[PDB]
Design a protein around this ligand. Structure first.
Ligand SMILES: O=C(O)[C@@H]1CS[C@H]2CS[C@H](CS)N21
Ligand SMILES: [Zn+2]
Ligand SMILES: [Zn+2]
Length: 229
C-alpha cells in the first residue's frame, strides 16, 4: 500500500488518472491482491471486474458512492475466476448491468460463480461486437486469444494511456506465468502480443496481480510464454 492510496474497509484504491482508479481486494490463501478498475465517464461510473467476494464488492460500491458520488451504470468482468467474478451478486443487488465474454458466462456455473446478465461476443479480429457492448463509453473491449484462460478479455480506456491486461499480463519482474491447467500454452505468447498490438499507445499497463507497469510487462510476459511452446 503506497502513499496516495486510499483504504475503505478491506479495499485499497489508487487514482491512476483524473477519471480512473484501481481497486484492490485481498483474499487470504497470505493476503493475495487482485486489481480491477473504476472509470468516471461524464455523469456515470463504469467498473471493470468485481472483488473476490460479494461483501468486498459492496465495499467498492460504497466507496464509489462516498468518494465519487455518481451512479454505476455497468460492470464488465474479464474472466470466470473468483477474483474477477466473485462479487457478481453484489452488483446485481445494486441494480448494475453486468457484462462478460459469453464463454465466461458459460463457464461461471461450473466454477460456482454467478454469470453476468449479458454476454459479449467478438469478431474474428478480436474486437468486441459493438451491439453486445452498448453504451460502453470509453471502454474498448478486446479478446486477444487464449492465454491465461480460454475466456480472458482485456480493456483499454479511451482518452487515457491506460490498458487493462487482467490476469493475462504479468509484471515485468515476474518469475513465472503461474500458468495452470486452463492456460493455452501454445497461443499464450501470441495472445499477449495481440493485446499489445490492440492498444499500441497504452503506456500504463494495469493487471490483476501486480501494480501498474510499463509496456515491458507485455514483452516480458510474451517472453515467458515463448518458453512454454
Ligand atoms: O494465478 C494467480 O496468480 C492468481 C493468484 S492465486 C490464483 C487463484 S485465484 C487467481 C486466479 S487468476 N489466482
Ligand atoms: Zn484468472
Ligand atoms: Zn487473477
Amino acid at each position: 500500500m503506497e502513499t496516495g492510496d486510499q483504504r475503505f474497509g478491506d479495499l485499497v484504491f489508487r487514482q491512476l488518472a483524473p477519471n480512473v482508479w484501481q481497486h484492490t481486494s485481498y483474499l487470504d490463501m497470505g493476503a493475495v491482491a487482485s486489481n480491477g478498475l473504476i472509470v468516471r465517464d461524464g455523469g456515470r461510473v463504469l467498473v471493470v471486474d468485481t472483488a473476490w467476494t460479494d461483501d468486498q464488492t459492496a465495499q467498492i460500491l460504497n466507496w464509489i458512492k462516498q468518494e465519487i458520488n455518481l451512479p454505476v451504470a455497468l460492470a464488465v468482468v474479464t474472466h470466470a475466476h473468483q477474483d474477477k467474478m466473485g462479487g457478481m451478486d453484489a452488483l446485481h443487488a445494486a441494480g448494475i448491468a453486468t457484462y462478460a465474454n459469453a464463454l465466461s458466462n458459460q463457464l461461471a456455473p461450473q466454477e460456482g460463480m454467478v454469470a453476468a446478465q449479458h454476454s459479449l461476443t467478438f469478431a474474428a479480429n478480436g474486437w468486441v461486437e459493438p451491439a453486445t457492448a452498448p453504451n460502453f463509453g470509453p471502454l474498448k473491449v478486446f479478446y486477444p486469444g487464449p492465454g491465461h484462460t480460454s475466456d480472458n478479455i482485456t480493456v483499454g480506456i479511451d482518452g487515457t494511456d491506460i490498458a487493462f491486461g487482467g490476469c493475462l499480463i504479468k509484471d515485468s519482474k515476474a518469475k513465472s506465468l503461474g500458468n495452470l491447467g486452463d492456460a493455452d500454452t501454445e497461443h499464450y505468447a501470441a495472445s499477449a502480443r495481440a493485446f499489445g498490438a490492440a492498444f499500441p499507445k497504452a503506456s500504463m499497463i494495469v493487471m490483476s496481480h501486480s501494480a501498474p507497469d510499463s509496456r515491458a510487462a507485455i514483452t516480458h510476459t510474451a517472453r515467458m510464454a515463448d518458453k512454454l511452446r
